[PDB]
Amino acid sequence: TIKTKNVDAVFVEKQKKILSFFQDVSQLNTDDEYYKIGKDYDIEMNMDNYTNKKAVEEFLKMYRTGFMPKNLEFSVFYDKMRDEAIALFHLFYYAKDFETFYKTACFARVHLNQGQFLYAFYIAVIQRSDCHGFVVPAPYEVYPKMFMNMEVLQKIYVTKMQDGLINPEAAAKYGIHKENDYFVYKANYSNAVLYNNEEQRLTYFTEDIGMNAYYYYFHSHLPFWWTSEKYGALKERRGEVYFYFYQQLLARYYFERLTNGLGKIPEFSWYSPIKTGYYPLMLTKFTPFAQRPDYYNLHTEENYERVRFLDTYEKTFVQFLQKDHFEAFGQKIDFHDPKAINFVGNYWQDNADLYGEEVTKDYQRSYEVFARRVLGAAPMPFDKYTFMPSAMDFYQTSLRDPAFYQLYNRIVEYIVEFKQYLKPYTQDKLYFDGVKITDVKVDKLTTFFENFEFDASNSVYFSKEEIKNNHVHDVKVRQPRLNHSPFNVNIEVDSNVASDAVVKIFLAPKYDDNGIPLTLEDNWMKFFELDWFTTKLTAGQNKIIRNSNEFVIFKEDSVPMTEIMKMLDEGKVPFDMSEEFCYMPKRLMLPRGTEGGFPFQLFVFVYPFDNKGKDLAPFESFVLDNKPLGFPLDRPVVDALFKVPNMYFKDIFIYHEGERFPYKFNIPS
Amino acid sequence: TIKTKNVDAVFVEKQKKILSFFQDVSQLNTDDEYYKIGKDYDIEMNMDNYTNKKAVEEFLKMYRTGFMPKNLEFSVFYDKMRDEAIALFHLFYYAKDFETFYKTACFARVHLNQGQFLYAFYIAVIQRSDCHGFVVPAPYEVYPKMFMNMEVLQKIYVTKMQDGLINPEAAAKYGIHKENDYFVYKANYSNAVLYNNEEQRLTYFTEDIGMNAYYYYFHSHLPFWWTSEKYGALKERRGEVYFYFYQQLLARYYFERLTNGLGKIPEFSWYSPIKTGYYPLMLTKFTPFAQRPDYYNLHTEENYERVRFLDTYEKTFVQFLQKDHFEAFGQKIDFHDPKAINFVGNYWQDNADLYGEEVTKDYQRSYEVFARRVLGAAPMPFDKYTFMPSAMDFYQTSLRDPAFYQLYNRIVEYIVEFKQYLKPYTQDKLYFDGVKITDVKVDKLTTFFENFEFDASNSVYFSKEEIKNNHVHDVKVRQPRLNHSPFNVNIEVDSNVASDAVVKIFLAPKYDDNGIPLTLEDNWMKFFELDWFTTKLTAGQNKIIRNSNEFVIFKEDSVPMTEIMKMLDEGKVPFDMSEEFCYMPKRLMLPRGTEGGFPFQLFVFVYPFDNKGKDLAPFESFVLDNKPLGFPLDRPVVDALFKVPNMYFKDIFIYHEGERFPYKFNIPS
Ligand SMILES: *[C@@H]1O[C@H](CO)[C@@H](O[C@@H]2O[C@H](CO)[C@@H](O[C@@H]3O[C@H](CO[C@H]4O[C@H](CO[C@H]5O[C@H](CO)[C@@H](O)[C@H](O)[C@@H]5O)[C@@H](O)[C@H](O)[C@@H]4O)[C@@H](O)[C@H](O[C@H]4O[C@H](CO)[C@@H](O)[C@H](O)[C@@H]4O)[C@@H]3O)[C@H](O)[C@H]2NC(C)=O)[C@H](O)[C@H]1NC(C)=O
Ligand SMILES: *[C@@H]1O[C@H](CO)[C@@H](O[C@@H]2O[C@H](CO)[C@@H](O[C@@H]3O[C@H](CO)[C@@H](O)[C@H](O[C@H]4O[C@H](CO)[C@@H](O)[C@H](O)[C@@H]4O[C@@H]4O[C@H](CO)[C@@H](O)[C@H](O)[C@@H]4O)[C@@H]3O)[C@H](O)[C@H]2NC(C)=O)[C@H](O)[C@H]1NC(C)=O
């Protein structure tokens, strides 16, 4: 009941070497051969084993100067740390073949900082062509400390320090149980100990382990600091991809807001206090994460120069808008051209493609970075390697901070400003000659919470003894997560001539906060894409059934590594972990319903699938179409020029079943 | 012990003529020759005595409309006043020969405003090529009102009104003595009577008459409003000079902070209040200087327009930074080119070379001018001629205001940002083949205070009789100033191959406030240049000895103009007044030490003096090198790629002897 895939001899060996690097991540097994290789591995001597002579040499210059020390906390948002990560990445990426790649990782495991290494290695496995189709573990199994509050962490430490339970019945009262040879820890979301404002209503979504894993994967698939030359025709669509990822996410987030009675993400000002604080319960081996109190003055002394930069970055965009056509960064740009999204997105991201370069440079200040830093409310870094981490210093923690959504909402709104320059689609562009959707029905939509466990053993240090006996996997975290029942969408379509067609499904809200029905005019960016697929219509009447379990845009829960070691002994590999790893998890498709049925709408659009003109398959198997991302809702709409027979809006209601509140799953006795 | 130099009777005559203008500056001896000349001198009639037809006619058109009247305060920061000052400057500068120049000045002295006259005269003498080699007295002897508090000034005034002392022994209690036919007045720094913030710890430095006089010399050697075409080579290096002057000044000042336990120069915002006030104790014959209380809100109604200007001026720069390469002011500028420092500096000073013009124009609004006005806290000028002066309307007083250092720290920092586009030097450019420094040794470095007197006679008004008999020199001010004992520096070098070499000496802090050692990466701009020189290396081992009083970047105290008359009778002039006019005074070379010995470091650089492809001899006898100013600390450094055998960092300690506190010298007993 987990989507499998079969696998040969050479594959399993490599995959085992790859997975070796994600276990006991913060320690070293002296007896493991990865260590014997690693200790003595000579990079200079091996120079002929890399595609890029200057990458080896650049790495070597940095490595003698000195890399970040071990145990210190790694973040890519800081110059020196990132530069070392990139130098390391290149070395992984330009290794002639697997053997060389493997050995280089061995050395790097042994000699360099843990976070820096996993960061670079993870990315490398995703980017190397010979590695395509291999599997990596879930971010939460690799970095467990970042996916869980203190309370849990500390129970784990205590149990480990005691080598078990002094009182099993007392431990039980704290949600700690022995299940055969596992220690299982129940975990509440933070609102169960902290309700310091209404945003805490959303913790089952913002603290969700999958959602946060999802953002991490997105970063890794194409990090901002690197070109996208490797992905070919997506290079000319990179900005579009950046807008759409964020647009989709904020729609999804917004949906969660609506169902907990919260409305719009609030606007903010670099020159004013920001309302909602963030009080993180994460610990770092060396420090606590930094808090932002409520009404925090973003314009305090330490931030003056920072705010001057950020304000100018924005103002420079506002200038672009005002002048329509202009030259910036070596490019004549026209805001009338829909292709300009590429520039717009690239600018807001300060990625390598903005400059037409392979890697970004220190003097090219990113807006995202400094915005993250200021809103993170940290004191000034002590030095190049010693900073006070906030949620927004890591891709694995960002979604936890309401301020993150404020920051990307603002960015998305500026891109929407650019999108106002595009002419709206006319009838002719949308009309599907002789095709009409006559009905849509939907099975009941119910959400519900359900326990989920993940391997949390990397959070813990084992003894020399335990590392040798390989007893390194006995810590699991149990947590209630959002889920929903599978559902069919029944679509009835009429057409004169048989034809190849594209079907698209979107989710959007039905009402604003006041209970007025949504116009497309104001609300086209609040539509969330559920699925696209192709069918063949016949003359007459058509019945199209599509199940939620088969929506192209979502993945299944990933499998724990231990379960993957099991499968590799059988020649099996978890399919969704191989090629669908960076999709949103299925269980989070729907926002949490209400007991009464919260009102939403399904938008179904059917259009002709002409041929395979402009065709994305290098980055994402997403857009085998000539069409903008989120077509037909990638620009302003006029309600009356828009609605055509091959469109259907269906009113639907999202229900919720069982326990309403995650914490009711975590009570003892 | 004053460095002398011999001269002929033609010089003495011209020199006496030049000096005559600085006697009794606020009055007219209608008996003196300068009067007879001045009264009747017809300018129109003498048009053929000027290199520039239209400068004469421009002047005479200005003069018929009317110039700034007598007695009112002049400052070059106000449009109409500047333009009259320049108009008069041209007249002085284009005089055919000395005779013409002299008669012209006589006219200007009798008929024009005295601060206006003096300002132009001073510059003219430095600028006229036929005046190179001449001596001008110390600015504190010329504008003694600017170099002393109200307290001393009032005592001086009281003594003149009474025509002496009613009570010798009561006078003594007030720090007033008669020695010879002189009145000596002791004077404290302002902190002995005012302690409104911590910045008052530093008034022996910021109130130092030498330091302030220094800044006025710097301005006079190259006014922002005038092209540098007359200095040839320096033109393509003007911006670099501007940066270097402030960078140096601020390193020196920062050192005074550290020894007084005060740390970094605070940053500010145009949109926020600024913390540290200034409460000037200086008097204008017409008005009091403006006060800025602590927590002065920069952004009040009267400043809304000026602050919109400052902000765009800054932001345009942030945009240049973000753009890297761009066309500004009719020039394509590239930020990876180190030579762009010319444009960078010019942009911040808004000097004539920014526009490639002879003289700046009214509509070319200056950033520094408007920062000075905003921070000056004055109410709006009454009219074109009537303003409420602040320390920052004058070069003679600017250094007295903590806000001065914050303004230029601000500008320097923005320049540092651009410096990040420069590639750091490699091993290769810094490495002296076969040369190594084995040791550096320093004599004890000690500071101490000793009394210093100056002629303050210009602050006082004499009677018709006294003006006749020429008893007009009788007022001296006695004030403790910082000084230091002479010290030697032994450099021991090894070289296999004999050759010419440059030796450079730099001073720097050793620790921040936390007492962590300065890394070069962060702290390269906190280095202060003490000395530049060349020697001949031989095969083997050499000892290079250099005394602190051979240091090229510093000068001895000026001698009073009275003593210059004594000397001119022997046919002598003091050397350091003639060609070392605008260096910092030697006594202020070192920061005030502590009695336990404050930790600094001394940096010593030795590199080949190859040829002299391009060397500075125009304004400054300074960089006889193709090397950037502050080479090799003119751009960001990499600790690892930096240190080579021909560099030496030595830990040094700065002591202090006798009284720690200046006021202790002015106690009567
Ligand atoms: C309490 O607080 C303090 C203050 O923050 C902490 O003190 C710091 O501790 C760390 C140790 O954790 C120290 O780092 C070490 O410094 C050693 C020496 O530093 C300098 O020398 C290096 C070596 O080069 C020398 O070569 C010759 C000798 O023949 C000399 O000519 C020359 O002077 C050099 O000293 C230089 O490369 C470097 O630039 C330093 O200036 C290092 O030997 C050592 O390096 C090792 O460790 C690295 C770990 O990342 C690794 O990259 C390297 O490969 C190498 O093996 C190490 O880094 C700091 O010096 C020290 N700071 C200060 C200001 O004193 C203290 O740890 C903390 N205590 C507790 C309990 O928390
Ligand atoms: C620069 O800055 C420093 C610091 O601010 C100044 O230093 C201060 O100088 C003061 C003198 O001006 C000094 O005050 C004296 O202190 C001594 C020692 O205790 C006293 O003997 C003096 O008292 C006499 O004058 C008083 C009023 O002026 C009288 O009340 C008093 O009576 C006394 O007179 C004598 O005493 C007899 C009374 O029985 C009388 O019969 C007899 O005839 C005497 O005349 C002063 O109080 C400060 O103490 C000193 N501050 C410090 C911290 O040291 C310095 O003056 C400033 N310099 C300049 C040039 O401006």
From TrEMBL, chains A, B:
GO terms for cellular component: extracellular space. Residues 11-133 form the Hemocyanin N-terminal domain. Pfam families: Hemocyanin_C, Hemocyanin_M, Hemocyanin_N. GO terms for molecular function: nutrient reservoir activity. It is found in: Secreted. Residues 424-656 form the Hemocyanin C-terminal domain. Keywords: Secreted, Signal, Storage protein. PANTHER family: FAT-BODY PROTEIN 1-RELATED, LARVAL STORAGE PROTEIN/PHENOLOXIDASE. This is Arylphorin. The lineage of its organism: Eukaryota, Metazoa, Ecdysozoa, Arthropoda, Hexapoda.
